[PDB]
Each structure stands twice: as C-alpha cells, then as structure tokens.
Amino acid sequence: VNSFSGYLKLTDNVYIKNADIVEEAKKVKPTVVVNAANVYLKHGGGVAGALNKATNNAMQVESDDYIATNGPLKVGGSCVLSGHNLAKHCLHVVGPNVNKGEDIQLLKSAYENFNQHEVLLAPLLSAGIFGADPIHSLRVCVDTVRTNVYLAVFDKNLYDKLVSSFL
Numbered sequence: 561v562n563s564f565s566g567y568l569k570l571t572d573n574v575y576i577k578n579a580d581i582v583e584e585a586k587k588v589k590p591t592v593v594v595n596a597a598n599v600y601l602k603h604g605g606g607v608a609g610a611l612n613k614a615t616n617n618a619m620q621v622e623s624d625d626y627i628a629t630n631g632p633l634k635v636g637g638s639c640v641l642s643g644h645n646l647a648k649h650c651l652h653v654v655g656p657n658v659n660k661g662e663d664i665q666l667l668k669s670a671y672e673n674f675n676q677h678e679v680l681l682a683p684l685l686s687a688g689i690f691g692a693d694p695i696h697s698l699r700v701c702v703d704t705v706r707t708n709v710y711l712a713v714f715d716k717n718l719y720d721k722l723v724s725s726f727l
C-alpha cells in the first residue's frame with residue numbers, strides 16, 4: 561500500500577492520473593520522481609522546467625555540478641540525483657526528442673531505467689515538447705516498465721484520450 565490517490569489502474573503495475581506532477585510530488589513526496597531530462601540536464605521548459613522551478617533552481621545547481629563532473633547523459637540514459645523538496649530522489653531520464661531528430665526506438669531504452677526503482681511518479685517520456693506521440697509513449701511504458709509506475713498527465717484533454725484509446 562502506498563499514498564498515491566485517485567489513479568486509474570491500467571495494468572498490473574501502471575497507473576494514470578490527470579495531474580500536475582509538481583503538485584503531485586509536493587503532496588506525495590514519493591521516493592522517486594522522474595524528470596523529463598535532456599542530456600545536458602538543462603531544465604528550461606516542459607516538465608523539467610516546472611520541476612526545477614518548484615525547487616527554487618536547486619535542481620539546476622545540482623545538475624550543473626553533475627554535468628561538470630560527468631559530462632552529458634546518453635539519450636535513453638538516466639542519473640539519480642536529489643529530489644530536493646519534491647521527492648527523496650529524482651531520476652533524470654532522457655527520452656528521445658523528436659524535435660531534434662532523435663531515434664524514437666530509444667524510448668524503450670529510456671523506460672528501462674524505471675525498472676531500477678520499485679515505485680515511481682513519472683510523466684510520459686518524450687511527450688509534450690519532446691515531440692513524440694503520447695499514445696505511443698504510454699504503450700511503450702506499459703510494455704517495458706515492470707515496476708510500479710504512477711503516471712501524471714498534465715493535460716486533461718490528453719488524459720481522457722489516453723484512457724479511452726488504451727488497449
């Protein structure tokens with residue numbers, strides 16, 4: 561039993577809700593919140609910009625030190641950093657950015673990072689400003705993630721379409 565509330569159950573391990581991931585994280589304080597990161601951990605917009613703003617830029621400060629030490633992530637890769645005031649940990653996961661020409665096949669590799677964590681609050685990878693089809697992202701999530709994932713979908717209109725078309 562966990563403290564996630566109001567989710568629709570899609571499969572044995574995948575749950576979905578119309579919610580602002582920032583507000584969800586502040587309420588639940590989950591062990592792991594997933595950020596929709598880029599390889600530079602430049603949290604300028606989308607989910608990443610919103611999560612960073614909620615940390616008063618502390619996420620960006622930590623991220624800049626991480627990059628200065630380690631260099632960029634790989635598309636499809638991830639790193640675990642602090643969750644600041646939002647979660648115990650933040651799993652920064654890089655889905656492919658379609659608006660950069662990146663190979664959508666890497667979306668499965670990106671979701672595989674979730675399997676290293678027993679429970680996660682997460683957005684749909686590569687959705688929004690990363691340019692992928694969210695229906696496809698949800699399908700890849702369900703077919704790749706085996707741990708317990710709670711998906712926050714900000715757009716109410718998009719949430720209803722994902723549920724109604726879910727196979």
Ligand SMILES: OC1(CNc2ncnc3[nH]ccc23)CCOCC1
Pocket residue numbers: 579580581582606607610683684687688694712713714715718
């Ligand atoms: O959910 C999508 C990604 N964007 C966010 N998701 C959750 N919480 C958020 N807070 C700020 C941005 C944001 C992906 C599916 O298409 C709709 C947008």
Ligand SMILES: [Cl-]
Pocket residue numbers: 605606607687688689690
């Ligand atoms: Cl977005």
